[PDB]
Amino acid sequence: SLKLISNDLRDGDKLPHRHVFNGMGYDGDNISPHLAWDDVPAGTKSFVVTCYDPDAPTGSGWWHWVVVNLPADTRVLPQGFGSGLVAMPDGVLQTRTDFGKTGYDGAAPPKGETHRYIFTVHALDIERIDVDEGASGAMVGFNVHFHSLASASITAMFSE
């Protein structure tokens, strides 16, 4: 089955400071973590990668990063892919996060809280989801829900 791994994170471990937000009282490097996947289901035509915190106290969690329309041959996202280190491959789109912009912005939980930061890769059965960069994480999620063949995730914990 689809497997997601990372050179930076380890499922269940504390999110390294390199991926923590650089503002809101924090001083992390704010760099998106490397992600890599294997064993993709037959019929996969594209992938969606997201970072979500289900514990943010907002009534709907918090989308930290949303990448859509990665081509069928994608098997990796280098560190900093969502931080402006690299130009986007043709057709790939980073959509809108709860930070009101596109791209990766890291963890920045409230005082005394410990939250889960879930990185997920979804293999879809369609080549392109029809959204533009203003699409919200829920709008991308609705598309993923109807087109997902498989998903795999890594969860990092972060507190303070």
Nearest to 72 by CA among 139, 114, 138, 128: 128
- In DSSP terms, which residues pair with 120 in a beta bridge? 50, 153
- In DSSP terms, which residues pair with 123 in a beta bridge? 47, 150
Cα separation of 102 and 94, whole Å? Answer: 6
Segment (H or E) for 159 = strand 148-159
Residue 120 amino acid letter: T
| CA-to-CA separations, 128 to 48, 103, 113, in angstroms, rounded | 10, 19, 37
Resolution (A): 1.8
Segment (H or E) for 115 = strand 114-124
Q: How far apart are the first and last CA of the chain?
A: 35
Cα separation of 140 and 98, whole Å? Answer: 13
Segment (H or E) for 137 = helix 137-147
**Chain-centroid distance, C-alpha 114:** 19
Nearest to 120 by CA among 80, 154, 149, 73: 154
- For tokens 């369609």, name the residue: 126
Q: Which two tokens stand for residue 39?
A: 């064993």
**Chain-centroid distance, C-alpha 158:** 16
| Contact status, residue 51 vs residue 65, Cβ threshold 8 Å | yes
Burial class (CB in 10 A: 0-12, 13-18, 19+), 139: middle
Q: Which two tokens stand for residue 47?
A: 């992938």
Residue-range domains of the chain with CATH: 1-160 (3.90.280.10)
- For tokens 């829900």, name the residue: 145
Segment (H or E) for 64 = strand 62-71
